[PDB]
DNA sequence: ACTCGGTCACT
DNA sequence: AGTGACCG
């Protein structure tokens, strides 16, 4: 209607590096390039755990959270790159640093929110407006969108590239003919900018990535996953009804867990589109005020979560699991590993201070004991006055020590977790 | 023995 | 301050 908002106010993108750890190792070792490849941490137990898988390898059914020995069964010629091991634990410095490479390049084009080590949201609203004035009254060539997919098109050719182009042509012709909306043009320009951003990333780092372009973060992330790897997908406001009509609820971000399952069970539906039938009040009564309102808008393709201008992580942490018989049963053992964790943490913290002009003021300590269903048996915190590994390990020990029911440590600890938080300018 | 990272909501 | 859901 005249007064119903359509959530077409912004142009937002979600960029995801494809199989990012694998790409990092592949850039470093040319032998791994263009091959079924995976990144493994630890080697002793069942060949180690796969944490990242190349698309060649995925074709064989190889997945993350899979034992290397089992991956080798599915893909005999699988090549493996090992995560760096420092102080007896996995060290992800190489990947964090690679992430910084990419993020810095992205920031040149637009404002970014660092979602994760391999994921970032991008707010293109301002950039699109500027590009439009420069580009005013100028048709947009398909050549400007060499890797772009328009979801829902074509509508009305057997090769995938043929289909992509036909879909693109229909979209562009419509744009061109004045049949589409102002918001549609804005998304289109956003896509052009993302193509340029992704080209810059590849040229300057060698890394490829997939991206989604839409009017909000949720649609952008969903769009990103539609065409991978090394491709980008534009999801228009108009494409939502058809797209959501067969979209499982769990596919929407934040709906992949218990809430999503409750939605399906309580309402007796499967797909995101089915949510439109319910009143905002109905949804709120079942799932709470905040969730209900969010669901009511989201099923209609509307989401208002802002892309936060955050280039750096809010927290800096390290942890190690001690599963099965490796569980820590002695006091000296626990202290030694706390020291290992504290030492890596100190190095990363000092680096962070020099690079980013900030200091952490809080240290969080978490542990898990054997037989405990919960991920965390306890979570305690204390002041972080100095970037000193010995002091940090000592303090962490002090806060968790009464946890021991009773030289020996009982019950044995299956997890140790240190996190630096509450940063201040410096 | 589905790691080791992380952000955000509830109370 | 502490627990926990959610993401991959």
| Inter-helix orientation angle A93-109/A20-28, to 10° | 100
Distance in angstroms: CA A321, C1' C1: 25
Widest CA span in chain A: 79
Domain identity same for A27 and A99: no
Return d(Cα A373, Cα A54) in angstroms, integer. Answer: 33
Residue A149 β-bridge partners = A233
CATH assignment at residue A56: 3.40.1170.60
CATH assignment at residue A280: 1.10.150.20
Domain identity same for A9 and A152: yes
Task: Identify nearest nucleotide to residue A370 by CA to C1′ distance.
Answer: B1
Domain identity same for A235 and A253: no
Domain identity same for A13 and A151: yes
Domain identity same for A70 and A26: yes
Q: What is the tally of structural domains in chain A?
A: 4
CATH assignment at residue A104: 3.30.70.270
- Residue A64 is labelled as binding a ligand: yes
In strand C, which positions have an atom below 7 A from any protein CB? 1-8
Q: What is the 3-state secondary structure (H, E, C) of chain A?
A: CCCCCCCCCCCEEEEEECCHHHHHHHHHCHHHCCCCEEEEECCCCCCCEEEEECHHHHCCCCCCCEEHHHHHHHCCCCEEEECCEECCEECCHHHHHHHHHHHHHHHHHCEEEECCCCEEEEECHHHHHHHHHHCCCCCCCHHHCCCEEECCCCCCCCCHHHHHHHHHHHHHHHHHCCCCCHHHHHHHHHHHHHHHHHHHHHHHHCCCEEEEEECCHHHHHHHHHHCCCCCEEECCHHHHHHHHHCCEHHHCCCCCCHHHHHHHHHHCCCEHHHHHHCCHHHHHHHHCHHHHHHHHHHCCCCCCCCCCCECCCCCEEEEEECCHHHCEEEHHHHHHHHHHHHHHHHHHHHHHHHHHCEEEEEEEEEEEECCCCCCCCEEEEEECCCCCHHHHHHHHHHHHHHHCCCCEEEEEEEEEEEEEEEEEEC
- Residue A352 is labelled as binding a ligand: no
Method: X-ray
Return d(Cα A286, Cα A415) in angstroms, integer. Answer: 36
Resolution (A): 2.0
Nearest by Cα to A106 from A228, A198, A4, A25: A198
Among chain A residues 237 through 266, which have CB within 7 angstroms of nucleic chain C?
250, 253-260
CATH assignment at residue A337: 3.30.1490.100
Of A34, A61, A88, which residue constitutes the final position of a domain?
A88
Task: Identify nearest nucleotide to residue A312 by CA to C1′ distance.
Answer: B6
C-beta of residue A364 within 8 angstroms of C-beta of residue A418: yes
Return d(Cα A351, Cα A356) in angstroms, integer. Answer: 8
| Inter-helix orientation angle A182-205/A125-134, to 10° | 100
Domain identity same for A343 and A410: yes
C-beta of residue A124 within 8 angstroms of C-beta of residue A11: yes
Return d(Cα A186, Cα A181) in angstroms, integer. Answer: 9
Nearest by Cα to A131 from A193, A174, A182, A183: A193
Domain identity same for A312 and A351: yes
Domain identity same for A197 and A269: no
Of A88, A105, A130, which residue constitutes the final position of a domain?
A88
- Residue closest to sugar C1' of C2 by CA: A379
Q: Quick check: A398 CB within 7 A of strand C? A: no
Q: For the beta carbon of residue A11, count every other beta carbon within 10 angstroms.
A: 28
- Residue A392 is labelled as binding a ligand: no
C-beta of residue A258 within 8 angstroms of C-beta of residue A235: no
Domain identity same for A234 and A120: yes
Domain identity same for A129 and A171: yes
Is A66 exposed, middle or buried (CB count within 10 Å of its CB: 0-12, 13-18, 19+)? buried
Pairing verdict, β A79-82 and A37-41? parallel
Domain identity same for A141 and A175: yes
- Residue A119 is labelled as binding a ligand: yes
Distance in angstroms: CA A421, C1' C4: 18
Distance in angstroms: CA A258, C1' C6: 9
Q: Quick check: A374 CB within 7 A of strand C? A: yes
Q: Quick check: A290 CB within 7 A of strand C? A: no
Domain identity same for A113 and A75: no
Range of the domain at A348: 307-426
Of A212, A231, A248, which residue constitutes the final position of a domain?
A248
C-beta of residue A205 within 8 angstroms of C-beta of residue A105: yes
First to last CA, chain A: 51
């Amino acid at each position: 209607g005249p007064h119903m908002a359509t959530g077409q106010d912004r142009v937002v993108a979600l960029v995801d590096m494809d199989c990012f750890f694998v790409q990092v190792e592949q850039r470093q070792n040319p032998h791994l390039r263009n091959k079924p490849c995976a990144v493994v941490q630890y080697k002793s137990w069942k060949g180690g755990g796969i944490i990242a898988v190349s698309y060649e390898a995925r074709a064989f059914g190889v997945t993350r959270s899979m034992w290397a020995d089992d991956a080798k069964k599915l893909c005999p010629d699988l090549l493996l790159a090992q995560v760096r091991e420092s102080r007896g634990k996995a060290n992800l410095t190489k990947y964090r640093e690679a992430s910084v490479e990419v993020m810095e390049i992205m920031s040149r084009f637009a404002v970014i929110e660092r979602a994760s080590i391999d994921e970032a949201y991008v707010d293109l609203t301002s950039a699109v407006q500027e590009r439009l004035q420069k580009l005013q009254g100028q048709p947009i060539s398909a050549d400007l969108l060499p890797s772009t997919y328009i979801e829902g098109l074509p509508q009305g050719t057997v090769q995938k590239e043929g289909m992509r182009k036909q879909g693109l042509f229909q979209w562009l012709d419509s744009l061109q003919i004045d049949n589409l909306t102002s918001p549609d043009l804005q998304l289109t320009v956003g896509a052009v900018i993302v193509e340029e951003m992704r080209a810059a990333i590849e040229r300057e780092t060698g890394f490829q990535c997939s991206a989604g372009i839409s009017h909000n973060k949720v649609l952008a992330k969903l769009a990103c996953g539609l065409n991978k790897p090394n491709r980008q997908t534009l999801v228009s406001h108009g494409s939502v009804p058809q797209l959501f009509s067969q979209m499982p609820i769990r596919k929407i971000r934040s709906l992949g867990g218990k809430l999503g399952a409750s939605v399906i069970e309580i309402l007796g539906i499967e797909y995101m589109g089915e949510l439109t039938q319910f009143t905002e009040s109905q949804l709120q009564s079942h799932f709470g005020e905040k969730n209900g309102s969010w669901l009511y808008a989201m099923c209609r393709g509307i989401e208002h979560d802002p892309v936060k201008p955050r280039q750096l992580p809010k927290t800096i942490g390290c942890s190690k699991n001690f599963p099965g018989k490796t569980a820590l049963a002695t006091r000296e053992q626990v202290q030694w590993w706390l020291l290992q964790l504290a030492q890596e943490l100190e190095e990363r913290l000092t680096k962070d201070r020099n690079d980013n002009d900030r200091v952490a003021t809080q240290l969080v300590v978490s542990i898990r004991v054997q037989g405990d269903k919960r991920l965390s048996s306890l979570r305690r915190c204390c002041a972080l006055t100095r970037y000193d590994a010995h002091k940090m390990s000592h303090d962490a020990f002090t806060v968790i020590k009464n946890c021991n029911t009773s030289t020996e440590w009982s019950p044995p600890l299956t997890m140790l977790f240190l996190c630096a938080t509450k940063f201040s300018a410096s």
